[PDB]
Amino acid sequence: ERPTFYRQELNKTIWEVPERYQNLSPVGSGAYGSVCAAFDTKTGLRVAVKKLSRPFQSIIHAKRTYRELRLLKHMKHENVIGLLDVFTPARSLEEFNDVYLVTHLMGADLNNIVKCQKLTDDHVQFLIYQILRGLKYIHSADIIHRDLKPSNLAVNEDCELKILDFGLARHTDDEMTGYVATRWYRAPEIMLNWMHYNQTVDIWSVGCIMAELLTGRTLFPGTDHIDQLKLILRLVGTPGAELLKKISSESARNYIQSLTQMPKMNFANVFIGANPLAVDLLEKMLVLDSDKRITAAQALAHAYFAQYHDPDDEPVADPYDQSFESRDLLIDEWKSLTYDEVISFVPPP
Length: 349
Ligand SMILES: Cc1ccc(C(=O)NC2CC2)cc1-c1ccc(C(=O)NCC2CC2)cc1
Known about the structure:
Layout: E1 5-10, E2 13-18, E3 21-27, E4 35-40, E5 45-51, H1 59-74, E6 85-87, E7 100-104, E8 108-109, H2 110-116, H3 121-140, E9 153-155, E10 161-163, H4 181-184, H5 188-191, H6 200-215, H7 225-236, H8 241-246, H9 250-256, H10 267-270, H11 276-285, H12 296-300, H13 331-344
Antiparallel strand pairs: 1-2, 3-4, 4-5, 5-7, 6-7, 8-9, 9-10
Helix pairs in contact: 1-13, 3-6, 6-11
Bound molecules: the ligand Cc1ccc(C(=O)NC2CC2)cc1-c1ccc(C(=O)NCC2CC2)cc1.
Domain Protein kinase: 21-305
Main location: cytoplasm
Protein name: Mitogen-activated protein kinase 14
């Protein structure tokens, strides 16, 4: 049964949304795309409404629209952003051309938390616990976040946390250039394209985030890719023979071999005053060889989280069929698939 929709101008375009959503107000300062906060009068929830920009203008846009909708429809986990609603004012596939995604709105991101608050060790435990609990779920569906950073960890007043923006990858070279947070949380294998990477890139990012909650300071605030790699290698040491062999980029291998060999530093001296259990977990996360990093499931059982860990309440995801990713389709075929997903949406309980 079709809701009645109303129109207003927001973010220099016409937003057309069901009446249940009231007091739309732009948020994010552009960062999360075209997102408005709203009040969902039907549920009493503060919601975030994302209007997809030009979702079917190219094959690339059409496929990424389908991708985002597929991802959100799948994720049903307390620590992972999920889909409250998805709609279009279109009454048929022919007229279908805008997609609006509705999620919970959290009051802040972690970037603002670590900037404006003092985090106790207990706050760090709880926050990192929740990130790993959400990542266990994401990783179990064979989704890689690839871009985990403080600004995509959404947090309410009770420090309850949801992970945003997983599996969408993105980013231009210019965006990754220079003294920029966009690059500081990236695993070096993906920063320098050493090899075909996998979900283990996300654990590096968690290590960088955790260290920063502990010290209040960016762990590897490189001024550029090369300066960042040097900051990283000073802390964790230069690669050994075994890791070198795994760098399939011959070019990248050759460069990294030009560097003066350095040993791994003592993490107790780097993280003075930190809980020894935090120091140990950092050591297990910040391993240069991605093969040897602790996994999210393993990390949840680490002694640092003894107060939060519950093995009966760390769920995994239902199978996520992402065979569409291998598929070459036309714009109108991606658009039809997206429409089927809009039409079949059933809201959460
Ligand atoms: C609305 C929306 C739609 C999609 C996605 C997403 O992650 N998609 C990728 C597929 C996973 C995210 C959102 C969204 C959810 C929450 C906030 C929020 O609370 N921001 C932090 C506070 C402002 C300080 C912003 C955007």
